[PDB]
Design a protein around this ligand. Sequence first.
Ligand SMILES: N[C@@H](CC(=O)O)C(=O)O
Length: 287
Amino acid sequence: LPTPVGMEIMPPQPPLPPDSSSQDCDPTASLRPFATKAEADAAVADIRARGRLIVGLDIGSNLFSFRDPITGEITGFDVDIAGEVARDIFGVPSHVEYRILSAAERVTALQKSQVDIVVKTMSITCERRKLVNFSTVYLDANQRILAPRDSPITKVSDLSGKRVCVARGTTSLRRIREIAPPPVIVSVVNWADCLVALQQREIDAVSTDDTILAGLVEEDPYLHIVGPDMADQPYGVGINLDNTGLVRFVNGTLERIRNDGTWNTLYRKWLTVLGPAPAPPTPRYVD
Ligand SMILES: N[C@@H](CC(=O)O)C(=O)O
């Protein structure tokens, strides 16, 4: 039976203070799109000259960026968001090259200019905004708990003393580190590994974005999502800190798809297992 490479039982730590998830920089405010098409096209001239948009994500995140088992094609909500950016740059969604990244590599890939954008369920936080830039919010998720249907776990305090799996490099870890008494924290490279670990009964529960958890439930209907909202997860397109022009450009793409029906279509395609489509997230601008 398979075993995820890189599984670590983390050293026990005292709980973090409850306000460790505070987000007081107003992190979700971003830059207004360009007023003219000429300004927008100039901001992406270097991408156009390279002939493709280079997008950081992975191919193992069900519903968001994965390989379709019927068609063999790379697909999902995040893949489609990235393709809409490419459509605005090139005229059609199909000039994209992917760089495969883990959750723990999203910031460094941007710092090192190894991708143009990261579209990989990337929560916008004050801490991350010191290192990278972000578009406006394109999907608002919330952290919850995934457990087998025969588990009595239904609330956060039930995680105390139990084995909870988290992918390294995620906001999900910080929130689990606030639980008192602590769970046993087991960390892995990606959320698909947590699913394997739960299937093999090496852990008791997984806690992350309900969107990501829904993709795991789709693969294993013996599991269900429980508990209250544990932490807001506002997704943004990650961009190099200094490429403010690309921030404005991507924010133009998001204005387009929020208002022309495409956002609604993408939610209905990928996320209806969580319920009826909400209104698209309202963008917030600093300027
Ligand atoms: N959205 C959360 C969880 C994840 O992306 O895996 C984060 O940005 O860390």
